[PDB]
Write a protein that binds this ligand. Structure first.
Ligand SMILES: O=c1cc(O)n([C@@H]2O[C@H](COP(=O)(O)O)[C@@H](O)[C@H]2O)c(=O)[nH]1
Ligand SMILES: O=c1cc(O)n([C@@H]2O[C@H](COP(=O)(O)O)[C@@H](O)[C@H]2O)c(=O)[nH]1
Lengths: 220, 220
């Protein structure tokens, strides 16, 4: 048993201005309790933005840092990220098992979680990532990873990834809306959908979030 | 014709405390004019550290951010990084051509450079990256990439990557010292070596740098 994030919907907050990011996040907080913060916001406004969001909104924070370095550097990135208050960090699987294990070790030390990114949602993912993705997922299973990221834009791939990681793993999925993925279809396989632009570029982000949730009401 | 970095030696400044990072960098500045700053330092001390180093030391700065996202996010990361004053940014090739092109476009807009990371130096690189690395390098060539990163720990791989990118491309190489790579052998194929721990953890970082340079004097 694992509790769903609110409405199975995670906000990808990739606005690069603190005031805009705070405005939109506050506007959709009644619908979303889990926010993904990545480098567009962090490199513009600083790591302190993580604790600020956590305090102001009382939301979960996933640091989407696509950690993709050697083990020693990965350990340092993870430590800094958890010190900043992130609940979880997203790590690339493609650099291999030692790089992932380094992140898992720090997460264990600090009482936090790692999400393993398997296949990516964009067209370029077909070149190198897709062919390795099943094996990346199996590596995750072998390492004891319980949380995964896979692509809304390829539900047949998402289904295959779900098959590899099992029903007990937690799977979140970006590529919904702007990149062409469908909320309902994605939630056949993923526990939660990640949505950025379709919400944060909307004239009314709250209405956009509400509309997405309405379209998946029967899956909640 | 391209000018070598001073002594063909790039410092990987992965200390996480500003005072320590400034001390070590200042101590070795007579030997090294090009510094690689990554997320260990940036996530601990902020993006302002890039401009501070540039001003205080008058050195080149390579932002080692292993950029590894979708095109839209990559563009944002690159813009923030060049705004912060970085001369170049390191981008992963594994996510594919569109993701790389997004970084190249921003570099072109802002008069900066992209380095393409092909094969990595750590053991886990053997699992997925190594098998794709030749094709990643060829993709770089096709995209007009002129600057590359490849592994000191596998000189036979470094040689192959040099063959693919040609003599006119600029190639820098980490994994020297701590990870087992040899300065002189690496410089048979790479234009410059990247060195972190062997310098920054030394009792006397200046002496460590001087020693490395002494060992490769005939290649300068
Ligand atoms: O495969 C992936 C993995 C991601 O983390 N992402 C991230 O998920 C978000 C997608 O946002 P959007 O809904 O605006 O397309 C972005 O933050 C992107 O960096 C992705 O798009 N595809
Ligand atoms: O394949 C690669 C690519 C890298 O950027 N690096 C980076 O180069 C540096 C190696 O530092 P060191 O000399 O302490 O091993 C680190 O900053 C690491 O993140 C690497 O080690 N291997």
């Amino acid at each position: 048993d694992v509790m769903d994030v609110m409405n199975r919907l995670i906000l990808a907050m990739d606005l690069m201005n603190r005031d805009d990011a705070l405005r939109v996040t506050g506007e959709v907080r009644e619908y979303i309790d889990t926010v993904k913060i990545g480098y567009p916001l962090v490199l513009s406004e600083g790591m302190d933005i993580i604790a600020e969001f956590r305090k102001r909104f009382g939301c979960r924070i996933i640091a989407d840092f696509k950690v993709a370095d050697i083990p020693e550097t990965n350990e340092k990135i993870c430590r800094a990220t958890f010190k900043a208050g992130a609940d979880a960090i997203i790590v690339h699987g493609f650099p291999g098992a030692d790089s992932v294990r380094a992140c898992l070790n720090v997460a264990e030390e600090m009482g936090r979680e790692v999400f393993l990114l398997t296949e990516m949602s964009h067209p370029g993912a077909e070149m190198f990532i897709q062919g390795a993705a099943d094996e990346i997922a199996r590596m995750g299973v072998d390492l004891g990873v319980k949380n995964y990221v896979g692509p809304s834009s390829r539900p047949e791939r998402l289904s295959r990834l779900r098959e590899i990681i099992g029903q007990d793993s937690f799977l979140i999925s970006p590529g919904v809306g702007a990149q062409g993925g469908d909320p309902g279809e994605t939630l056949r396989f993923a526990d939660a959908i990640i949505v950025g632009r379709s919400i944060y570029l909307a004239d009314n982000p709250a209405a956009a979030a509400a509309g997405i949730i309405e379209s998946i009401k029967d899956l909640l």
